[PDB]
Amino acid sequence: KPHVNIVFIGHVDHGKSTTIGRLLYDTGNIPKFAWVMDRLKEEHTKFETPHRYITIIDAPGHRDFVKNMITGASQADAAVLVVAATDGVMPQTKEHAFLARTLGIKHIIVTINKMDMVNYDQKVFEKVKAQVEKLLKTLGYKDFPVIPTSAWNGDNVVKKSDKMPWYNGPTLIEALDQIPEPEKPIDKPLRIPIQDVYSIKGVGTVPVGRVETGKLKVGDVVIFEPASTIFHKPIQGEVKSIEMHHEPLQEALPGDNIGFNVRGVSKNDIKRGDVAGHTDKPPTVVRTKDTFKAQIIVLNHPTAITVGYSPVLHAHTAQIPVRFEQILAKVDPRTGNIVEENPQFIKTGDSAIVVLRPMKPVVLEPVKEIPQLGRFAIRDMGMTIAAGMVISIQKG
Ligand SMILES: Nc1nc2c(ncn2[C@@H]2O[C@H](COP(=O)(O)OP(=O)(O)O)[C@@H](O)[C@H]2O)c(=O)[nH]1
């Protein structure tokens, strides 16, 4: 049985806790329902399905929810978006779906909860379903289940409802049982951030780095960025050999720290913070004429962060000066929800959505595409100011 991590999102009071509660209650996984729900409120929990081991890895409402999601300390394979049939899709529903998209969560399960409060009505479910479909289509999601539920009464969480014969789809627990296995780093495009560059006599130019994603084989042609962008010509060549622990390899996989000899590349053309990829799928370069959106959590700062702040960005093996161009939103670190648009400043403990401009070219990837190159730290004044994740890149 494959292990799978899930997170429950959705607007406050739409029924995330109750749904989790009901799941645990009906599968006999508790560590009257009303009593029990009280006890749970006061105090990771796993449960087992026929085909899956399921961990609820994190949840909106605790101190480090946004931090854990941003740093990748908490990582979900699927998100269950809870939407109340009474309220429908609210702004905070849209925000949370955007967050799931940003994190590269590919599988979404929607529950339309509190069906009992709208008399289990089909017309109501369909109206809300249509709102849910419009939002998730906007974000690129397709073929996700939309499940009418009453977390309080039990309908369609674990047991099939006798109150909604018009619904033919799966229950929540049946939808969780069908969460596809996580995509593997080996199947993402090759990326090798360069740690150091050596010249070995009789051999030539030998970069050293850890394969983060994809697979490097002897004979592959690799291209280096931002070296290629900086020098206005492709810095690339054939991989003649691979070594680890002073022994030959024919291929290198995610996690392998390797030396690789590249034909036709000069030692001076590549350095620390360059990244190797296939010419087919070259590492993305954010130039100084470009910008990028990021979600950050402010870990420490002596005063407050404002537009124009210019610290150092650290990602993979690179470091560059970066400028804060805009702060688009202040984000509650507990919920992941927006509490202010266009705030003037950000302080320790705040999360924010920011537009950053690299002051030197840098390889960055949106976390939704390649997370190993989409997470970064901000450093300044001898400390770690912020942890961040790349949302998107805007070319100039
Ligand atoms: N009638 C009804 N009440 C519900 C349902 N789901 C949650 N509630 C109640 O609505 C309130 C908010 O639910 P909660 O799980 O705390 O929401 P969260 O903030 O999303 O975790 C609580 O009083 C729940 O007991 C439901 O399906 N039907």
From Swiss-Prot:
One of its GO terms (molecular function) is translation elongation factor activity. It catalyses: GTP + H2O = GDP + phosphate + H(+). GTP hydrolase that promotes the GTP-dependent binding of aminoacyl-tRNA to the A-site of ribosomes during protein biosynthesis. It is an enzyme of class 3 (hydrolase). Keywords: Cytoplasm, Elongation factor, GTP-binding, Hydrolase, Magnesium, Metal-binding, Nucleotide-binding, Protein biosynthesis. It is found in: Cytoplasm. Residues 1-186 form the tr-type G domain. Transmembrane segments: none annotated. InterPro entries: EFTu-like_2, G_TR_CS, GTP-eEF1A_C, P-loop_NTPase, Small_GTP-bd, T_Tr_GTP-bd_dom, TRAFAC_GTPase_members, Transl_B-barrel_sf. The gene is tuf. Its EC number is 3.6.5.3. Residues 58-61 are annotated as: G3. Mg(2+) binds at S17. Residues 10-17 are annotated as: G1. Belongs to the TRAFAC class translation factor GTPase superfamily. Classic translation factor GTPase family. EF-Tu/EF-1A subfamily. GTP binds at residues 10-17, 58-62, 113-116. Residues 113-116 are annotated as: G4. NCBIfam families: EF-1_alpha, PRK12317.1, small_GTP. GO terms for cellular component: cytoplasm. This is Elongation factor 1-alpha. It comes from Pyrococcus horikoshii (strain ATCC 700860 / DSM 12428 / JCM 9974 / NBRC 100139 / OT-3). Residues 150-152 are annotated as: G5.
